[PDB]
Design an enzyme around this catalytic site. Structure first.
Site: not given
Length: 288
Positions: A150, A244
């Site tokens: 990420e 998310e």
């Protein structure tokens, strides 16, 4: 392209039961459920298998999210911490295998959230990170597991803050089962242009996390959804898109996300379901 949501959208803590979310995600027309690795790693075998069977029954793809704590910092210059972190991630992958989960994304290459009160060494943390990730990539092979690295905003991490650093980092790791994960929330802070960051990442893009600048569900903000849709077409992305959204203040999730006001208008589970259904329709339209 396959669409999903992080279970955390509905919750206040990371370590909860996931079974309920498999049915719910299928009901809402989603392809993927992302669960917290933290809620797998000490889950009884009985429950890991039940989760695998529920996913098969409903035809839902399960993915795992992680932020390693300080004690498991695989980027640490302290060898004991480094090795503790590697062992913990191997344990996470053992549990992933039993639940039939193949993809782990987040801060799996360092610790999160970063604590800036003490000093750090970016160069030294980086080479430790790459060696840790190569070893975990090798252990992952036996489970056909992929690590998603990420790219995070400066406030949460110091290693990989833009697509450029993340692509350079992943090229150097040089493993087929290690890919870049981009996130609209993080790209929004660090990139000159979100669509151009996606284009740049191209073949390295293993997963996209999506939400508004303030982590509301897509459609509630000013994120350039059409440009993002076009950029994904430009790189012929046929991969996973996982919503998310974080709109709940007060819990362990609220604290780690640093949300200090309600963004849900005190939405019930049901209300959050309907808004996510609308959001998904909006994103698919925006992505053609």
């Amino acid at each position: 392209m396959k669409y999903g949501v992080y279970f955390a959208y509905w919750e206040d803590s990371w370590d909860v039961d996931f079974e309920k979310y498999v049915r719910k995600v299928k009901k809402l027309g989603l392809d993927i459920l992302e669960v917290a690795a933290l809620g797998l790693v000490n889950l009884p075998e009985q429950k890991l298998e039940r989760l695998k069977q529920l996913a098969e029954q409903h035809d839902i793809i399960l993915t795992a999210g992680i932020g390693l704590p300080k004690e498991y910092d695989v980027s640490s210059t302290d060898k004991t911490v480094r090795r503790n972190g590697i062992t913990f991630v191997k344990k996470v992958m053992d549990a992933m295998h039993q639940a039939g989960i193949h993809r782990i994304g987040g801060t799996v290459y360092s610790y999160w959230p970063v604590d800036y009160s003490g000093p750090f060494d970016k160069p030294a943390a980086r080479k430790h990170s790459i060696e840790s990730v190569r070893e975990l990539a090798e252990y992952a092979r036996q489970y056909n597991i992929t690590l998603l690295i990420e790219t995070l905003n400066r406030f949460e991490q110091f290693l990989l803050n833009d697509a450029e650093e993340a692509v350079a980092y992943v090229k150097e790791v040089n493993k087929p089962n290690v890919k870049v994960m981009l996130d609209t929330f993080h790209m929004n802070i660090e990139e000159d242009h979100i669509a151009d960051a996606i284009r740049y990442t191209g073949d390295h893009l293993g997963q996209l996390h999506i939400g508004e600048a303030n982590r509301k569900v897509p459609g509630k903000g000013s994120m350039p959804w059409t440009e993002i849709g076009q950029a994904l077409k430009d790189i012929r992305y046929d991969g996973y898109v996982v919503m998310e959204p974080f709109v709940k203040t007060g819990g362990q999730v609220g604290r780690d996300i640093k949300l200090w006001r309600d963004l849900s208008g005190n939405a019930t589970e049901e209300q959050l379901d309907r808004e996510l259904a609308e959001s998904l329709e909006f994103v698919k339209a925006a992505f053609g």
